[PDB]
Design a protein around this nucleic acid. Sequence first.
DNA 1: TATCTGGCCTGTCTTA
DNA 2: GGTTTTTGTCTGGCTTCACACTTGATTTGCATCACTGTGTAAGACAGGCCAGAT
DNA 3: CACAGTGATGCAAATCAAGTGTGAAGCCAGACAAAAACC
Lengths: 118, 618, 340
Amino acid sequence: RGKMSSYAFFVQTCREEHKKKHPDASVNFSEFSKKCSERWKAKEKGKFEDMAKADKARYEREMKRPPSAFFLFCSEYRPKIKGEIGDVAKKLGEMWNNTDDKQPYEKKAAKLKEKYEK
Amino acid sequence: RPRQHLLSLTRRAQKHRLRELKIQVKEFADKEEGGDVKAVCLTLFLLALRARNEHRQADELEAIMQGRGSGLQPAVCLAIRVNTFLSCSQYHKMYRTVKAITGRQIFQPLHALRNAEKVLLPGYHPFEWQPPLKNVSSRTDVGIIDGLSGLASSVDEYPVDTIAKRFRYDSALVSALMDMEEDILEGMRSQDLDDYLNGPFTVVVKESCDGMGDVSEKHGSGPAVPEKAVRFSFTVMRITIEHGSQNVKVFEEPKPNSELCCKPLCLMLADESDHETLTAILSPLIAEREAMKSSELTLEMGGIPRTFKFIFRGTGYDEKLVREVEGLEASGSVYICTLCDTTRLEASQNLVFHSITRSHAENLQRYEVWRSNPYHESVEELRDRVKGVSAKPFIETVPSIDALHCDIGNAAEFYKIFQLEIGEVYKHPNASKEERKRWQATLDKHLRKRMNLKPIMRMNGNFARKLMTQETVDAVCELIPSEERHEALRELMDLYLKMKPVWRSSCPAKECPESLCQYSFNSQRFAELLSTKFKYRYEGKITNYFHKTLAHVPEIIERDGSIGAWASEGNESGNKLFRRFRKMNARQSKCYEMEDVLKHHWLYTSKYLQKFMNAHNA
Amino acid sequence: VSLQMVTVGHNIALIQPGFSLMNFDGQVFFFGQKGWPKRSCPTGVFHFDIKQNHLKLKPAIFSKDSCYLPPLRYPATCSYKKHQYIIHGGKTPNNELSDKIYIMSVACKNNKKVTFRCTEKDLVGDVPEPRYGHSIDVVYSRGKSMGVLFGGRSYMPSTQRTTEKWNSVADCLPHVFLIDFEFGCATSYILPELQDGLSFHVSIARNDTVYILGGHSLASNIRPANLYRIRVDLPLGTPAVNCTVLPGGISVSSAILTQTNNDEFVIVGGYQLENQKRMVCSLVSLGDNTIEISEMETPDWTSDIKHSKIWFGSNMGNGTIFLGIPGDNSEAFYFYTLRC
DNA sequence: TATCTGGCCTGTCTTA
DNA sequence: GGTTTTTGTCTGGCTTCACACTTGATTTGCATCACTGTGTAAGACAGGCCAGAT
DNA sequence: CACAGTGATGCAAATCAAGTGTGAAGCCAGACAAAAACC
Ligand SMILES: [K+]
Ligand SMILES: [Mg+2]
Ligand SMILES: [Zn+2]
């Protein structure tokens, strides 16, 4: 994790204030660093100064090749299942295991095997 | 806090360091390069690298920006494995380490290379013989066969003391041909012929066979095999095509004696001199070979069926093995020549004027004459009539000369003349064995001083190569007092060196034409020198190889065009492969050592695999 | 029955499993040398004599009118009565089977050196196909003599022979062959009693009957304990043969056989199982119509013979058997004599 | 006379 | 302490990426098997034998 | 209780490839402030 300086807690609280004052608005980073730097440049800062040591204690605790016949069959049955990745594969495998059925897909793979070899 | 080095820091920390130069780079991109910070930094870095002579990292970054998947196809891994002599076990070590450190599978694992090998071994490609081969099997998926070919091994039969593995001969040839296919296609092209042309090709196969000693037996259960091996091999020498009334040379082996292209066909643990076991194992090879003479192989190359007719030339045999397999007597016999009928006394009187008369078919007739003795003759007379063919031949060899062993024998004779010239035997006929030992000791020491040769027990090719020079005669002459004999040694060696290139070069007609032209003339004066000034050694006798070298080199050259290219030296170099592979590329077990060596030695001879290693030299 | 070690001479390498010994007047001779004949002995036939347990093999020459038969392993050999020897079948050094038949007879015996006549006998009719491991004997029936030839092995026939199993063998068809040497012809007889193929059996011939003992049937791979009697009738017309099966036979392949005395022979050697040698010995006593096989006292074998996986040998003819076992590896085989 | 050492030879034993 | 450099925190949404699961088929990883080779020349000692010394 | 291999086998473990939308990680913007090293 990370540990935050007093100036950093300051910048965070300013970003929270700016978010509540202006929700719809998107903040520019370079300008916001300028204006936060000027606001930080003796009593106001004491709250953030004492918050930083609590975050330090938090840091302490944090420290401690044509395809297989199954692939060919799988790709076609993919659209139907989508209508109905890991869950898809499980459904595909169960139905392929439950299915002369795979003889045509293996004939297509047999035709493609010589094409891969050459 | 001293500034740490930039590369150690965190992403945040280096951002702060480069924040000043970051924006400065951003201006330059919008101003000069259309706001392409990515590309202007990619280029700035790449150029900084090559400025520091660090082109490798730049080149690698370039391949990352492109989509470069660096991996080697398995067959390329096979070629690197086979041809660098790495074993699967060592290659698996290399593969594993490369993949771990790079994270990428640059080299393929062994199961892939093992699958890549399948194409390259016998029994993969389909083929047909028209007509079908006699007694051979029309199956075409026959890889490594048991070399005993069903030899009976029950305790009643003859004892089986050998282990053997082989390829079927045709099946082997097919795989060899398919291995040469790219080179056959390219050869037609470079002859301006149709790539798709399918005419009757002719394949000339060189056939070699070889006995080895000192093949130690493994421990472990099996047949108590002998410590010897025999290797049958073939080399594809040339392929022509018939395109009109012309025979067009589309392939001719460039390195006809290289272990790279002697293909193994039969490995057996056996003694070449054990005729019973030698004929049991090889008979099925000569049967397969006979059938292939009477048929045309149709085999599919590049989509287009091609026909191949085969010519088998058995020439990779030393004289001892020729005589054993063609029913001839052993080389000490008075019938000195395997090519003619001359007697060793006649070879010393005539020397040069003999023609080639012996043949495999004559020897078969003569055995049968020997066996039947149809004129009811005395043994002397019968042997004179059949010219020493008292055994039945069983292998067809070409009547030729093996250049390696010829080279070696001749040098061993010269080495003996050098000895005798030092002892002045031309002048002093008798000398004790001790007196002769010392002649050799002098010659041995001097060859070390002037030629850097150490002494060796039996004569070598390289020793022969280095001894037979005129620098060596210079060295030897320092030891001989008589300069009348310095002159004879110098001439004898000059003639010899005018002769040698004829029987050793691949095309004497193109490479030593004056040497080829003068052979008959030069070999006459060589022979006359031996009769005149070396009468002390060459009266009544001459060696086998001096005879072959002096009397049959010109005829063989016109019948065949080369002697050297048909030498055994290639098959011999294969033995070196045998030994290396038996140790480091096979399962260390008695019942797999032969097939692992045969399989892996075949691969090592594949031209398809060799080509990947000449890819740098595109 | 005394076993005795034998020393051998310089050319001991000739002796191989499948050799033959022939007896001519108490002089023993050797045939079937390993390898083709060399110039040391061009016939491949040797005077074979053991003098005080030392075997010297010494070359023998042939007559001018002789054939030069190749060395033959496992031929069918047979003695004929004027004494001569029959050789049929066999493997040649090139692993071919010879269909040929040769006749070995003495031609000359001057100065106790022997010259042999080796003549080739041609054969017509139903000639038995080329074989080894088979038996041939002569019978005698009604003053007429006839040769009987049974069993053995050959290679597959040309129709079915494959270079991949080029050396495969198979038992010949168990037809009994009658072979008349005088006419040069050969008649085959199929008997319902002989249904199985058989080789490496023992053949004892007395008068007009031949006994077939033991052997190995390749198809079934069993060494039969059966005995088969074959009696050849030689009348003026067609000769006929009757086969009778007699229980109480030996189970042994490759056994050797010597004749100790008239009407009795000893059987020694051979194999009961592929890896069990037959250490026992059998006595055969022949009556006119009866054959008696009885256990006899085993010999005092040595620890080499006992544990050798294989052995081989042949009868020398005087009731003594020349026996060889594979030895150290030097001298490849160890040889013993065994007297009776 | 009647022994007697030393080389000499061969052969086994110990480690490689 | 003063001073200098590493690492952040503050926010909303931008991108890229791993993950979710099932099926059958490839592709990798790995142990297993019985065997490999490197161990590989000469000196110490005893006991017989016989000619020349004692 | 030597030890690093020798290749082929075959079984277990990994990887693949497809469907799509979850959350998680890193990132950007300006400004100022913790820690953590140095005079
Ligand atoms: K070479
Ligand atoms: Mg060799
Ligand atoms: Zn000649």
